[PDB]
């Protein structure tokens, strides 16, 4: 006759996580590496998005 012994399944090989990096670099060098910095009363805030 024909008998069913066990069940077979394929196991995942490697786990992969990805979120979208998709963007531009980011305006940081112009802040930290800037040649000159603003005074403590004419305040320079740069927007980052």
């Amino acid at each position: 006759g024909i008998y069913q012994t066990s069940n077979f399944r394929v196991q995942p090989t490697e786990s992969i996580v990805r979120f979208p990096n998709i963007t531009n670099l980011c305006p940081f060098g112009e802040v930290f590496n800037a040649t000159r910095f603003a005074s403590v009363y004419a305040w320079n805030r740069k927007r980052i998005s």
Partner: nanobody
Framework: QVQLQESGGGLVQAGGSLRLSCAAS????????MGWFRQALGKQREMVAV???????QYANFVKGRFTITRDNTKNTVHLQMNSLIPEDTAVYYC?????????WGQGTQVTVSS
């Protein structure tokens, strides 16, 4: 990179007149607030006049009644009308632009009056 061009210095005898100027060629966020600073060799920076583009005068008492400044809103240029020069008031002058984002300084102009 907002750049200010300073010119109008030189050597003038006692009682003469000098015409300084600084121009703002940058983006200039919002209405700005022009200014000027006087620093003698070996002293701090003594501001002369920091008139806003609108009002408030803001004139120091060091040279009261002698120095006046004009505004040209067409090109946002600045001119200084210096009169009755005295050797005590001779020093290095720097144009100051407050702006909205950050404030800048000129390269320096030399004013020397003696007799």
């Amino acid at each position: 990179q907002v750049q200010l061009q300073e010119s109008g210095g030189g050597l003038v005898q006692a009682g003469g007149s000098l015409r300084l100027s600084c121009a703002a060629s940058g983006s200039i966020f919002s209405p700005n607030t022009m200014g000027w600073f006087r620093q003698a060799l070996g002293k701090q920076r003594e501001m002369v006049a920091v008139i806003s583009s609108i009002a408030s005068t803001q004139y120091a008492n060091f040279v009261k009644g002698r120095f006046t400044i004009t505004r040209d809103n067409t090109k946002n240029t600045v001119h200084l009308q210096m009169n009755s020069l005295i050797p005590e008031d001779t020093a290095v002058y720097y144009c100051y632009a407050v702006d909205k984002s950050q404030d800048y300084w000129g390269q320096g102009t030399q004013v020397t009056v003696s007799s």
